[PDB]
């Protein structure tokens, strides 16, 4: 007589990335050959709640069989180069 | 006699990326050959709640069979270069 | 006698990307050969609630068979170059 | 005697991309050969609620068979170049 | 005796892209050969609620057979170049 | 005795793209050979509720057979170039 | 004894594209050979509720057979070039 | 004894494209050879509720057979060029 | 004993394209050889409720056979060029 | 007589990355050939709640069999180089 | 007679990375050939709540069998180089 199962959840989770920089360049009075190269590669990435979540099952009977499988797989790559930069004065 | 199963969820999750920069360049009084190259590659990416979620099943009987499979797979790549930059004064 | 299953969900999730920059260039009093190249590649991307979600099933009887399969797969790539930039004064 | 299954959902989710920039260029008093190249490639992309969602099934009887399959697949790419930019004064 | 299944949903989801820029160029007092190239490639794209959604089925009897299949597939690409830009003063 | 299935949905979803720019060019006091090239390629695209949605089926009897298939497929591409731009003063 | 199935839907969804720009060019006091090329390629595109929607079926009997198939497919492309632009003063 | 199926729908969906620009050119005090080329290619396109929608079927009997097929397919392309533009002063 | 099927729909959908521009050119005080080329290619296109919609069928008997097929297909293309534009002063 | 199982959870977890920098460059009075290369590669990445979560099962009967499997797998890599940078005075 | 099991959890955990730097470069009065290369590679990464969490099971009967397996696996790598940097005075 009787069976029971329950659940409850809450999230208020914060998952920011790179969300508040203040980059800037200023004030060059000059007289000679100034040069700048600034922050030449930048990235951000966020991933959440992937895969199998929240499912419910009900399967009565003594003779049965069951099989399952799962996978998750993530990859990234980056490359960069800077050249023959030149300046002279007089 | 009787069976029961329940669920509940809430989300208020925040998943920002690169959401608040303040990039700028200013004030060049000059007299000589200034040059700048600024932030030449930039990216952001967000992914959420992929895969299998929230499903419900009900399958009574003792003789049965069951089989399942799943996968998730994500990839990215980036490349960059900077050249023969030149300046002279006088 | 009796079976039951239930569900409930809520979302208020925020999933922004690159949503608030303030890029600018200003004030060049001059007299010599200034040059700038600004932020030459930029991207953002968001993906959400893909795959199988929210399905409901009901399949009574002891002799049955069942089989399932799933996949998700995402890819990206980027390339960039900067040239023979030149300036002189006098 | 009896079976039951239920559901409920809500969304108020926000999924912005690049939604609020303030790009600008200003104030060139001159006297020498200024040059600028600004933000030469830009993109944004959003995708949501793809695949199989919200379906309901009901299939009584002990002798049956069942088979299913699914896929999702997304790809992107980008390329860029900058040339023989030149300036002189006097 | 009896079977039941139910559903309910709501959406108020927001899915903007590039929706609020403020691009501008201003104020050139001159005297020498100014040049500008501005933001030369720009894109945005949004896709939503694709695939199979909201279907309902009812199929009683023990001897049956069933088979299904699905796919989704999205692709994009972009290219750009900038030339032999030149300016002189005096 | 008895079977039942139900449904309900609502949408108030917003799916804008590029909906609010403020592009402009101004104020050239002159005296030397100014030149501009502005935003030379621009696009936006939106797609929604494609595929199979909202269908209802009812098919009693134990001996039957069933088969289904589906696909979705989207593609885009873009190219651009800028030339031998030239200016002189005096 | 008895079967039932139901449905209901609502939409108030908004699917704008490029709907509110404010492009303009102004104020050239002159004295030297100004030139401009403005926004030379522009597009927007929207597609909605394509495919199979809202169908209803009823097919009793145990001996039957059924087969179905579906497809959706969308493509676009764009190209652009800018020439030997020239100006002189004095 | 008895069968039933129902439906209901509503739409108030908005599907605008390029619906509110404010393009203009102004104020040229002159004295030297000004030239402009403005927005030389522009397009917008909207498509909605294509394919198979709203059909109803009723086909009792155990011995039958059924077969169906569907397709949708959309394509576009664009090209543009700008010439040997020239101006002189004095 | 008994069968029933029902339907209902409403639309108030809005499907505008390019519906509200404000293009204009003004104010040329002159003294030197001004020239303009304005917006030289423009298009808009809308398509709606194509294909098969609203049909109703009723076909009792166990021995029958059925076959169907459908297609939709849309295409567009555009090309443009600008010439040897020239102006002189004095 | 009777069985019971329960659950409850809460999250208020914060998962930031690189969220608050203040990068800047300033004040160059000049007279000799200054040069800078700034922060040329930058990244951040966040991943959360992947795998199998929140599932519920109920499977009575003494004769049965069960099998399961799972995997998670994440990878990244980065490369960078800096060139023949040169400056002279007098 | 009777069985019971319970659970409860809370999190307020903070999992920041690199969240508050203040990088800057300043004040170069000059007269000789200054050069700088700043922070040329930077990264941060966070991962949380991966694997199997929160599941509930109920499986009565004396004759049964059970088997399970799990894995988690994470990898990263980085490389960098700096070149033939040169400066002279007089």
Three-state SS string over K8-68 comes to CCCCCCECCCCCCCCCCECCCCCCCCCEEEECCEECCEEEECCCEECCECCCCCCCCCCCC
Q: Nearest 5°: CA angle at C59, between C57 and C65?
A: 110
Q: Which of E6, E14, E53 sits opposite D15 (nearest CB)?
A: E14
Which residues of chain K come before a gap where C and the next N are over 2.5 Å apart?
A: none
Please report which residue ranges of G16-56 form alpha helices under DSSP H: none
Task: Look at B56 and D31 and tell me if their CB atoms are within 8 Å.
Answer: no
- The full DSSP string for E1-53 is -------------B---STT----B-----SS--EEEE--EE--EEEES-SEE
Q: What are phi and psi of A53, to 5 degrees?
A: -135, 145
Q: What 3-state DSSP class applies to C71?
A: coil
Touching pair F, D by Cβ (3+ pairs < 8 Å)? yes
Mutate which of A2, A53, A60 to test chain J, going by most J C-beta atoms within 10 A?
A53
Q: Which of B15, B30, B63 sits opposite A30 (nearest CB)?
A: B30
Q: What are phi and psi of G68, to 5 degrees?
A: -140, 160
Q: Whole-angstrom Cα distance, residue G45 to residue G43?
A: 7
CA F86 and chain centroid, separation: 37
| CB D41, CB D78: distance < 8 Å | yes
Task: Please name every residue paired with D47 in a beta bridge, in sequence order, or none if there are none.
Answer: C47, E47
Report the length, in residues, of chain H: 90
Residues with Cβ within 8 Å of G77's Cβ and at least 6 positions away in sequence, in order, are F76, F77, F78, H76, H77, H78
Q: Whole-angstrom Cα distance, residue C16 to residue A20?
A: 13
Q: What 3-state DSSP class applies to J86?
A: strand
Q: Whole-angstrom Cα distance, residue I34 to residue H87?
A: 10
CA I17 and chain centroid, separation: 7
Touching pair F, H by Cβ (3+ pairs < 8 Å)? yes
Q: Whole-angstrom Cα distance, residue E44 to residue G46?
A: 12
Closest CA–CA distance from residue E81 to any residue of chain G (Å): 10
Q: Quick one: residue E54, left, alpha or beta (phi over 0 = left, psi -120 to 50 = alpha)? A: left
Which chains touch A (3+ CB pairs under 8 A)?
A: B, C, J, K
Tokens of D4: 């039951």
Q: Which technique was used to obtain these atomic coordinates? A: cryo-EM
Strands (E), chain A: 35-38, 41-42, 45-48, 52-53, 73-78, 86-87
Task: Look at A58 and C3 and tell me if their CB atoms are within 8 Å.
Answer: yes
Q: Whole-angstrom Cα distance, residue H35 to residue H58?
A: 69
| CB H84, CB G81: distance < 8 Å | no
Task: Look at G27 and F30 and tell me if their CB atoms are within 8 Å.
Answer: no
Helix (H) or strand (E) segment spanning residue D52:
strand D52-53
Q: Which of I3, I5, I32 sits opposite G30 (nearest CB)?
A: I32
Mutate which of G45, G67, G83 to test chain I, going by most I C-beta atoms within 10 A?
G83
Name which of A16, H63, C49 is nearest D11 in CA terms: C49
Q: Whole-angstrom Cα distance, residue D45 to residue C45?
A: 5
Name which of G25, B57, J50, F72 is nearest H22 in CA terms: G25
Give the residue from chain F lying closest to G42, CA to CA: F42
Q: Whole-angstrom Cα distance, residue A40 to residue B38?
A: 7
Q: What are phi and psi of B54, to 5 degrees?
A: 75, 0
| CA separation, residue A39 to residues F10, K18, K38 (Å) | 46, 17, 9
Q: Whole-angstrom Cα distance, residue B32 to residue B88?
A: 8
Strands J86-87 and I86-87: unpaired
Q: What is the rounded radius of gyration, in angstroms, for the C-alpha atoms of chain B?
A: 29
Give the neighbor-by-neighbor strand order of the sheet with C73-78.
I73-78, H73-78, G73-78, F73-78, E73-78, D73-78, C73-78, B73-78, A73-78, J73-78, K73-78
Name which of D87, C30, J31, K87 is nearest A90 in CA terms: J31
Tokens 């799943």 found at: B70
Q: Cβ of J49: how many Cβ atoms within 10 Å?
A: 23
Q: Residue D40: how many CA atoms within 13 Å on its side-chain side?
A: 30
| CB B51, CB A50: distance < 8 Å | yes
Tokens 């594209």 found at: G17
Q: Whole-angstrom Cα distance, residue H86 to residue H69?
A: 58
Give the neighbor-by-neighbor strand order of the sheet with K41-42.
I41-42, H41-42, G41-42, F41-42, E41-42, D41-42, C41-42, B41-42, A41-42, J41-42, K41-42
| CB J21, CB K39: distance < 8 Å | no
Q: Whole-angstrom Cα distance, residue E32 to residue E26?
A: 16
| CB F87, CB E86: distance < 8 Å | yes
Name which of D75, D69, D15, J76 is nearest E75 in CA terms: D75
Mutate which of A8, A33, A47 to test chain C, going by most C C-beta atoms within 10 A?
A33
Residues with Cβ within 8 Å of G43's Cβ and at least 6 positions away in sequence, in order, are F42, F43, F44, G78, H42, H43, H44, H78
DSSP I74: E
Name which of K36, H75, E43, B81 is nearest D42 in CA terms: E43
Q: Nearest 5°: CA angle at K82, between K76 and K85?
A: 170
| Resolution of the entry in angstroms | 2.9
Cα torsion G20, H23, H75, G49 to 10°: value is 20
Q: Whole-angstrom Cα distance, residue F15 to residue F12?
A: 10
Q: Whole-angstrom Cα distance, residue K74 to residue J72?
A: 8
Give the residue from chain E lying closest to F57, CA to CA: E57
| CB E26, CB F36: distance < 8 Å | no
Q: Whole-angstrom Cα distance, residue C80 to residue B80?
A: 5
Furthest C-alpha separation in chain I:
98
Name which of C41, D52, F73 is nearest H71 in CA terms: F73
Q: Whole-angstrom Cα distance, residue F70 to residue D52?
A: 11
Q: Whole-angstrom Cα distance, residue E50 to residue C50?
A: 10
Residues with Cβ within 8 Å of I57's Cβ and at least 6 positions away in sequence, in order, are H55, H56, H57, H58, H59
Q: Whole-angstrom Cα distance, residue C1 to residue B2?
A: 6
Q: Whole-angstrom Cα distance, residue F36 to residue F22?
A: 18
CA torsion through residues K47, J68, E51, H55, sign:
negative
Burial group, residue D49, by CB count within 10 angstroms (0-12, 13-18, 19+): buried
| CB I85, CB I37: distance < 8 Å | yes
Tokens of I58: 């009723």
Residues with Cβ within 8 Å of E56's Cβ and at least 6 positions away in sequence, in order, are D55, D56, F5, F7, F55, F56, F57, G5, G7
Q: Whole-angstrom Cα distance, residue B15 to residue B18?
A: 11
Chain E residues with CB inside 8 Å of D10's CB? Answer: 9-10
DSSP C20: T
Q: Residue C58: how many CA atoms within 13 Å on its side-chain side?
A: 25
Q: Residue G49: how many CA atoms within 13 Å on its side-chain side?
A: 25
Q: Whole-angstrom Cα distance, residue G70 to residue E72?
A: 12
Task: Look at H45 and G42 and tell me if their CB atoms are within 8 Å.
Answer: no
SS3 sequence, chain F? CCCCCCCCCCCCCECCCCCCCCCCECCCCCCCCCEEEECCEECCEEEECCCEECCECCCCCCCCCCECCCCCEEEEEECCCCCCCEECCC
Residues with Cβ within 8 Å of D74's Cβ and at least 6 positions away in sequence, in order, are C47, C73, C74, C75, D47, E73, E74, E75
Tokens 């294909």 found at: I51
| CB G9, CB H8: distance < 8 Å | yes
Q: Whole-angstrom Cα distance, residue A43 to residue A78?
A: 10
Tokens 């695949």 found at: D51
Q: Whole-angstrom Cα distance, residue A86 to residue B19?
A: 35
Which chains touch H (3+ CB pairs under 8 A)?
A: F, G, I
Which residues of chain J come before a gap where C and the next N are over 2.5 Å apart?
A: none
Q: What are phi and psi of E28, to 5 degrees?
A: -120, 90
Q: What 3-state DSSP class applies to I67?
A: coil
Q: Whole-angstrom Cα distance, residue F48 to residue G15?
A: 8
Q: Whole-angstrom Cα distance, residue B66 to residue C63?
A: 11
- The full DSSP string for B1-69 is -------------B---STT----B-----SS--EEEE--EE--EEEES-SEES-B-----TT------
- Counting one residue from B and one from C, how many pairs have CB atoms under 8 Å apart? 326
Q: Whole-angstrom Cα distance, residue B33 to residue A32?
A: 7
Q: Whole-angstrom Cα distance, residue F64 to residue H59?
A: 14
D83 — contact with chain B (CB < 8 Å)? no
Residues with Cβ within 8 Å of K33's Cβ and at least 6 positions away in sequence, in order, are J32, J33, J34, J35, J87, J88, J89, K87, K88, K89
Name which of K49, J47, C74 is nearest B15 in CA terms: J47
Please report which residue ranges of chain I form alpha helices under DSSP H: none
């Amino acid at each position: 007589g009787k069976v029971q199962i329950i659940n409850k959840k809450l999230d208020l989770s914060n998952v920011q990335s790179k969300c508040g920089s203040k980059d800037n360049i200023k004030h060059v009075p000059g007289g000679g050959s100034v040069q700048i190269v600034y922050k030449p590669v930048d990235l951000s990435k966020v991933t959440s709640k992937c895969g199998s979540l929240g499912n419910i099952h009900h399967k009565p009977g003594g003779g049965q069989v069951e099989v399952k499988s799962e996978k998750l797989d993530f990859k990234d790559r980056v490359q960069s180069k800077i050249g023959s930069l030149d300046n002279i004065t007089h």
